[PDB]
Swiss-Prot record, chains A, B:
The chain holds residues 390 to 409 of 457 of the full protein. It is linked to Multiple pterygium syndrome, lethal type: Multiple pterygia are found infrequently in children with arthrogryposis and in fetuses with fetal akinesia syndrome. In lethal multiple pterygium syndrome there is intrauterine growth retardation, multiple pterygia, and flexion contractures causing severe arthrogryposis and fetal akinesia. Subcutaneous edema can be severe, causing fetal hydrops with cystic hygroma and lung hypoplasia. Oligohydramnios and facial anomalies are frequent. The alpha subunit is the main focus for antibody binding in myasthenia gravis. Myasthenia gravis is characterized by sporadic muscular fatigability and weakness, occurring chiefly in muscles innervated by cranial nerves, and characteristically improved by cholinesterase-inhibiting drugs. Belongs to the ligand-gated ion channel (TC 1.A.9) family. Acetylcholine receptor (TC 1.A.9.1) subfamily. Alpha-1/CHRNA1 sub-subfamily. Isoform 1 is only expressed in skeletal muscle. Isoform 2 is constitutively expressed in skeletal muscle, brain, heart, kidney, liver, lung and thymus. This is Acetylcholine receptor subunit alpha. The lineage of its organism: Eukaryota, Metazoa, Chordata, Craniata, Vertebrata. It is found in: Postsynaptic cell membrane; Cell membrane. The gene is CHRNA1.
UniProtKB/Swiss-Prot annotation, chain C:
Pentamer of two alpha chains, and one each of the beta, delta, and gamma (in immature muscle) or epsilon (in mature muscle) chains. The muscle heteropentamer composed of alpha-1, beta-1, delta, epsilon subunits interacts with the alpha-conotoxin ImII. It is found in: Postsynaptic cell membrane; Cell membrane. The chain holds residues 431 to 448 of 501 of the full protein. It comes from Homo sapiens (Human). It is linked to Myasthenic syndrome, congenital, 2A, slow-channel: A form of congenital myasthenic syndrome, a group of disorders characterized by failure of neuromuscular transmission, including pre-synaptic, synaptic, and post-synaptic disorders that are not of autoimmune origin. Clinical features are easy fatigability and muscle weakness affecting the axial and limb muscles (with hypotonia in early-onset forms), the ocular muscles (leading to ptosis and ophthalmoplegia), and the facial and bulbar musculature (affecting sucking and swallowing, and leading to dysphonia). Belongs to the ligand-gated ion channel (TC 1.A.9) family. Acetylcholine receptor (TC 1.A.9.1) subfamily. Beta-1/CHRNB1 sub-subfamily. After binding acetylcholine, the AChR responds by an extensive change in conformation that affects all subunits and leads to opening of an ion-conducting channel across the plasma membrane. It comes from the Eukaryota.
Swiss-Prot record, chain D:
It comes from Homo sapiens. The chain holds residues 421 to 445 of 493 of the full protein. It is linked to The muscle AChR is the major target antigen in the autoimmune disease myasthenia gravis. Myasthenia gravis is characterized by sporadic muscular fatigability and weakness, occurring chiefly in muscles innervated by cranial nerves, and characteristically improved by cholinesterase-inhibiting drugs. Belongs to the ligand-gated ion channel (TC 1.A.9) family. Acetylcholine receptor (TC 1.A.9.1) subfamily. Epsilon/CHRNE sub-subfamily. After binding acetylcholine, the AChR responds by an extensive change in conformation that affects all subunits and leads to opening of an ion-conducting channel across the plasma membrane. Pentamer of two alpha chains, and one each of the beta, delta, and gamma (in immature muscle) or epsilon (in mature muscle) chains. The muscle heteropentamer composed of alpha-1, beta-1, delta, epsilon subunits interacts with the alpha-conotoxin ImII. It is found in: Postsynaptic cell membrane; Cell membrane. This is Acetylcholine receptor subunit epsilon.
Swiss-Prot record, chain E:
Pentamer of two alpha chains, and one each of the beta, delta, and gamma (in immature muscle) or epsilon (in mature muscle) chains. The muscle heteropentamer composed of alpha-1, beta-1, delta, epsilon subunits interacts with the alpha-conotoxin ImII. This is Acetylcholine receptor subunit delta. After binding acetylcholine, the AChR responds by an extensive change in conformation that affects all subunits and leads to opening of an ion-conducting channel across the plasma membrane. It comes from Homo sapiens. The gene is CHRND. Belongs to the ligand-gated ion channel (TC 1.A.9) family. Acetylcholine receptor (TC 1.A.9.1) subfamily. Delta/CHRND sub-subfamily. It is linked to Multiple pterygium syndrome, lethal type: Multiple pterygia are found infrequently in children with arthrogryposis and in fetuses with fetal akinesia syndrome. In lethal multiple pterygium syndrome there is intrauterine growth retardation, multiple pterygia, and flexion contractures causing severe arthrogryposis and fetal akinesia. Subcutaneous edema can be severe, causing fetal hydrops with cystic hygroma and lung hypoplasia. Oligohydramnios and facial anomalies are frequent. Coiled coil: none annotated. It is found in: Postsynaptic cell membrane; Cell membrane.
Amino acid sequence: PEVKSAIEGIKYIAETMKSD
Amino acid sequence: PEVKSAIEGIKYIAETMKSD
Amino acid sequence: PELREVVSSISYIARQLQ
Amino acid sequence: RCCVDAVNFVAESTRDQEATGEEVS
Amino acid sequence: KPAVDGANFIVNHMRDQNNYNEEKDSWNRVART
């Protein structure tokens, strides 16, 4: 689940940067 | 070796954030 | 689609940083 | 597991920063 | 492959940012002295 969590975190970072 | 260098750079980013 | 999501996210982040 | 752990730490730090920013707001 | 290039660009940007901040902190300590 580590890789899946990392991928979800990267997606969250991208979405957060878009909102910012 | 560029992929390994990128992985080590991501590790460096995590270490930087921890120190910060 | 996980690899495509990763690629799109990383490309967006890199473009924003540039 | 280096990349996975590093990305997890980065995501956690950024999420906590955003959570604190919400309280600031 | 594009992910590796984007990661490398991000790492270079972060390293440049860190160097810049280090130079700023050095100037700050010089000013305090």
